[PDB]
């Protein structure tokens, strides 16, 4: 019971930090692609200068993979390893498409094609990010139920 | 004994995702300022084009404010508001310094002064970022024992 709860809680905190990191990528894609800081609106449009943001996006992406490496549980091993492959495929795609993403002047369209998972066309990484998102979300569902059934040890066996 | 364990975990998850967002700024500040994607190294140097990166930093910064606003706990009320106040000073400072931060060609130095809290000089927002990290962590410290004392009630 006590060993169950503390160890089961660790993974949920572990997984939900990955989801928080993913939302950092998703949020800059939705609200910061093609934008600049403005004193009143907070952000203002600046088209086709998304180069440094993509580096920051990839920066968070590799921080995500490191955290996926720190997750270890025999029950969740299959879903964590499946999550392990997906972030690696995403990070590799940004490397693969460096000719369009490795400059300061990356177009909005190609920037969105890389990190905006809700974009129309998703051939520069957004497919892999969504595939990654689904793998991570499949992990939260299994990890959350592992915690709850550890706590369902309050009433009923 | 049943409700509190679930309730405090909600508080812990809420705070630790703020820090996880807080960690998203830092890592981009540490590894992406003055950088570009490279097919082999993963990142390579590209100086003085940090505008969209810093715009992204502020984007997560206001996502942090949204998350601190969703926090409500009677005990942590004074400390949550303090983290709320700190988040606004950071976001206000970044917009306040738009003359240097709102363009594609923000220098590497100015970006580090804005979002790299361990930089040498911190006159463009990193000071307010430091205060924000410190205010949130005092909130994280309180939340950790808030959960733990719920579970040490088994023996």
């Amino acid at each position, epitope marked *: 019971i006590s060993k169950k709860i503390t160890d089961s809680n660790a993974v*949920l905190l572990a997984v*939900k930090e990955v*989801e*928080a990191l*993913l*939302s950092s990528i*998703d*949020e800059i894609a*939705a*609200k910061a692609i093609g934008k600049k800081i403005h004193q009143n609106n907070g952000l203002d449009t600046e088209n086709n200068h998304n180069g440094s943001l993509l580096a920051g996006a990839y920066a968070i992406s590799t921080l995500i993979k490191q955290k996926l490496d720190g997750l270890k549980n025999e029950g969740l091993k299959e879903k964590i390893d499946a999550a392990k492959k997906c972030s690696e495929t995403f990070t590799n795609k940004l490397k693969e498409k460096h000719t369009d993403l490795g400059k300061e002047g990356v177009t909005d369209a190609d920037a969105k094609e890389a990190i905006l*998972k*809700t974009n129309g066309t998703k051939t520069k990484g957004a497919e892999e990010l969504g595939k990654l*998102f*689904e793998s991570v*979300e499949v992990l*939260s*569902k299994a990890a*959350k*139920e592992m*915690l*709850a059934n550890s*706590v*369902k040890e309050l*009433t*009923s066996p | 004994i*049943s*409700k509190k364990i*679930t309730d405090s*975990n*909600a508080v812990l*998850l*809420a705070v630790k*995702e703020v820090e996880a967002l807080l960690s998203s700024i830092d890592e981009i500040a540490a590894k992406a300022i003055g950088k570009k994607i490279h097919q082999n190294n993963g990142l390579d140097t590209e100086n003085n084009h940090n505008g969209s990166l810093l715009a992204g930093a502020y984007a997560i910064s206001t996502l942090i404010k*949204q*998350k601190l*606003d*969703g926090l*409500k706990n009677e005990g942590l009320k004074e400390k949550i508001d303090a983290a709320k106040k700190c988040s606004e000073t950071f976001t206000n400072k970044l917009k306040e310094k738009h003359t240097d931060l709102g363009k594609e060609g923000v220098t590497d130095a100015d970006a580090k002064e804005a979002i790299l809290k361990t930089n040498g000089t911190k006159t463009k927002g990193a000071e307010e970022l430091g205060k924000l990290f410190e205010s949130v962590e005092v909130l994280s410290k309180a939340a950790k024992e808030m959960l733990a004392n719920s579970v040490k009630e088994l023996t």
Partner: antibody
Amino acid sequence: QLQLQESGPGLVKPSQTLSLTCTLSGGSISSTSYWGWIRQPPGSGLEWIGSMYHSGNTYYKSSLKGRVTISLDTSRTQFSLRLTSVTAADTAVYYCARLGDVFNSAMDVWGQGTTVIVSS
Amino acid sequence: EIVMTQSPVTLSVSPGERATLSCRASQSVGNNLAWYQHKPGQAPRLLIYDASTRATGIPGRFSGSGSGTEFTLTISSLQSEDFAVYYCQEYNNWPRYTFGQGAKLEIRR
């Protein structure tokens, strides 16, 4: 605190699209997640419409497949229901509700309910 | 192809007596079932989840068994407020649900 508040216009013409927005109050898309919509047609019980995720991945009842789309608003105060095209058998009361949590998952914080009538 | 069937569609019990609502699944939804109260004019309330556990805030008169395809919600000594329709709910594919028809609970006279 955990407060769900319903949406705009009912009285939509048949074969049109009814669009509803569920807006959060005192709450955010956090830990990092809330989802889902529920409806009750007259003379009939409740039935689930669809579910979402904080990322945005959606799952539908599959008799509304192709018909429904659930959407997440960036600046994530709210999420929307989109139903098209609408029969008179779509006239119902539509609820948005938080269908999740760490320790119970389904189906926990409900909206107040909004009425949408599909008639000419 | 997951079917939830409440045993009587309407149930009539005099106030203060025991009520036994039943829910049956066409196949095991396992340990994943919910019970709701819905008074006309309000949103449905969540009463039970995981088929045994009550959402905190609801009185001790409500209780639930489960663990497979048998499912029952019992209100011992139901009071004036307790007369409403009660639905059961499958969530064994958690983002995906199926309600039941509901079961009105009538004042018996």
